[PDB]
Motif scaffolding. Sequence first.
Motif, PDB file in Angstrom:
ATOM      1  N   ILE A  17     -36.240  17.292  -4.709  1.00  0.00           N
ATOM      2  CA  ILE A  17     -35.864  17.565  -3.663  1.00  0.00           C
ATOM      3  C   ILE A  17     -36.046  19.169  -3.014  1.00  0.00           C
ATOM      4  N   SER A  63     -36.324  23.674   3.381  1.00  0.00           N
ATOM      5  CA  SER A  63     -37.353  24.201   4.505  1.00  0.00           C
ATOM      6  C   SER A  63     -38.686  24.591   3.838  1.00  0.00           C
ATOM      7  N   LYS A  64     -39.507  25.067   4.832  1.00  0.00           N
ATOM      8  CA  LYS A  64     -40.801  25.571   4.305  1.00  0.00           C
ATOM      9  C   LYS A  64     -40.601  27.009   3.378  1.00  0.00           C
ATOM     10  N   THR A  65     -39.699  27.885   3.605  1.00  0.00           N
ATOM     11  CA  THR A  65     -39.727  29.226   2.850  1.00  0.00           C
ATOM     12  C   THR A  65     -39.188  28.782   1.469  1.00  0.00           C
ATOM     13  N   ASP A  66     -38.455  27.635   1.182  1.00  0.00           N
ATOM     14  CA  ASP A  66     -38.097  27.369  -0.312  1.00  0.00           C
ATOM     15  C   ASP A  66     -39.330  26.784  -0.914  1.00  0.00           C
ATOM     16  N   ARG A 106     -41.466  29.501  -2.893  1.00  0.00           N
ATOM     17  CA  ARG A 106     -40.549  30.271  -3.716  1.00  0.00           C
ATOM     18  C   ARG A 106     -40.733  29.326  -4.994  1.00  0.00           C
TER      19      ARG A 106
END
Lengths: 39, 768
Positions: A5, A8-11, A14
């Motif tokens: 899971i 969004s894109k930022t995760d 990371r």
Amino acid sequence: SNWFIIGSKTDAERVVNQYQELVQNEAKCPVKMSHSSSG
Amino acid sequence: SSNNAMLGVHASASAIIQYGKIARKQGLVNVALDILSRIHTIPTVPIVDCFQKIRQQVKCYLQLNECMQGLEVIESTNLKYFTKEMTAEFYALKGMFLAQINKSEEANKAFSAAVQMHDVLVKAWAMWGDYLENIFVKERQLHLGVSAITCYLHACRHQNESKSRKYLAKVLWLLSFDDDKNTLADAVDKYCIGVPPIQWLAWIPQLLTCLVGSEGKLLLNLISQVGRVYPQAVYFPIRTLYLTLKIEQRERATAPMWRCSRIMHMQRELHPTLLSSLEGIVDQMVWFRENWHEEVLRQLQQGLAKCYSVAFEKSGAVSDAKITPHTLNFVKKLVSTFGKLKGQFTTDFDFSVPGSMKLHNLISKLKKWIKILEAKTKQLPKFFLIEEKCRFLSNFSAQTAEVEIPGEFLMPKPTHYYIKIARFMPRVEIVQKHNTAARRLYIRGHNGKIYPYLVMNDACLTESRREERVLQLLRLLNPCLEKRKETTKRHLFFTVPRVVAVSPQMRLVEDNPSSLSLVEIYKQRCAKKGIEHDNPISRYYDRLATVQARGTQASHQVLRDILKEVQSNMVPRSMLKEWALHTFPNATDYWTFRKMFTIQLALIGFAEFVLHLNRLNPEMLQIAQDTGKLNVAYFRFDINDATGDLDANRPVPFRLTPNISEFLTTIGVSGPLTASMIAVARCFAQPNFKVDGILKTVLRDEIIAWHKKTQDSQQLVSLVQKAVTAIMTRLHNLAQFEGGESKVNTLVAAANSLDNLCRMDPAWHPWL
């Protein structure tokens, strides 16, 4: 057929940056970085 | 090829920049500049460190006659060449600086150059959109507002998980400035595709109230997008709104109902098992309703409360007190809903006639009806298992459907924080509330923890949607108290509960054990003695009538004497202090409970006085014993029925009882109580924090709901903005610093004064 899971894109980067940092440390035989895309 | 030396210089320069940056965040700019002036003594400074040095310095000058000095300091550096990516942020900063003053005829090209670099800066689009926002104050330029929302939508594409709720508030506020043409809705739909749906979970009620209104069909695309990803978050509110429309229209095809039905059908195909499971849970909640004993008892308590409000209005007049038509209809409804042997005894005893011309003969009788009904219903069962009267709720596990905890979608967070459903506990309890006896069930998640939840059956749905909006407003403002330092030191948080609306008459709320109110504490202490709880109220009314029976008007002195008589005989000044001394035998626990009580009380008092909230009844304040946190049930806005003035004309600013003042200490009412209010006042008064947008959106539909209840132009916009200016006027009157300390000390000194408490409603219990 395991799946992860992700939000969004930022995760996404990371997790990728954390995964890249972890795999880069305790190998020490390779040094490289290669990636591609399809779609 | 030296590398250690440059790393040390880079690390040292970063430490200087970080130390200088954090000094700026402290609110001090003079000391920050001295720290940032230390980099000049290092002969070798990298280019990137120099850019951060000037970025922090230009921010210090922006926060701080001196505008000429800050304008000429940026032209000294930046001489020959910079790289592309850092040649975009500080163009926006200087463009914002030029926009801070009247020079606006040349700042338009400055914003264009800042945004032209790579088009993916949140800051560049935000200030450019904000620069356009200042333009809308005059010369409306209707066909230009589509450009502002275009900038906001582009800025929301990259900003995530922080500083994004304020941008959506501006979009929603500017959407209500539309003419007959639908060009504003067309601009939103075509330019909104691409943003994640996680940012729309905090404005679900705002989207619903715009969909119901006229020319709101184009908004259905956003609702479908949210429902395609999160079906549970936009399921219960849709059903509640659909049922609300069905009931109100039944008393008197419907396009808003067709839109809701259309949204229901599109989400049926997406996870139909979850929707079926949710339907089963809702349909199996009809067995939790109470009997007619509590329904009659709850109605009588509401009627008694209404009688007290009517009786206080007839103060200073004759002792006739003619029965109001509203009360006469309430008595008629009671006869209709009540008229095997006790069901007809009330008709011929005292309810044959609602009263010819007496009002005190009705309140004095309802007192003993409550006493008779309270002692008779003390044998009511408290326990009932789940294996009977319901099968789907009892036979439920995590293998059936992917059902989450109700209330997990109120506020999005960067983390997941998704607790699932494991099994409903076959163990429920009945707890006696101030008006009814609601049932609390226990729900256990997959982590092993047990989460109790209380089932409410509150009627009067009209005065129920204005009770969750204020809680949503408080929940939105909660994260804003963590970005500062003064509010962080005192650990300030609103302690908002979790309320989920399932049906217009029944909804689920979060409840915890050992959560008792201040009025219940009085009941326990009064029951220990040999007196009844309603002695001070009765003594106030009848003694005043005898004084007025001599033909002498009631003055301020007589009110002071009777107030002192009540304080001398019935309620002592140190009732609460003795209760806490015996309840908590440990000294450490007593200090923590008292400190938390002071901290929570300041936030409650600040919210009640500033944002024009409802009066704080003693049966509304709840105190938790496990941790000491405080929460007050079901706030409400104070809007006059004649017009939306949003004025609260009360003597005291908030509730500051003499019992509460002595309970903490005479030192805690002055030092900690006022410092917390001052710290909160500064946090909300910072121009960096966007507070106007959130308030405008909440007050937008608040007036719309008020207008829809009691009988679509610029008057509504003017009325909403007038209320917003009143909110800011009161906020600024208690946050400025001058030679004097503040105006909070003046209002807290008059809050505990006996002069302002003797002229208060006896139901408010100024003595207790």
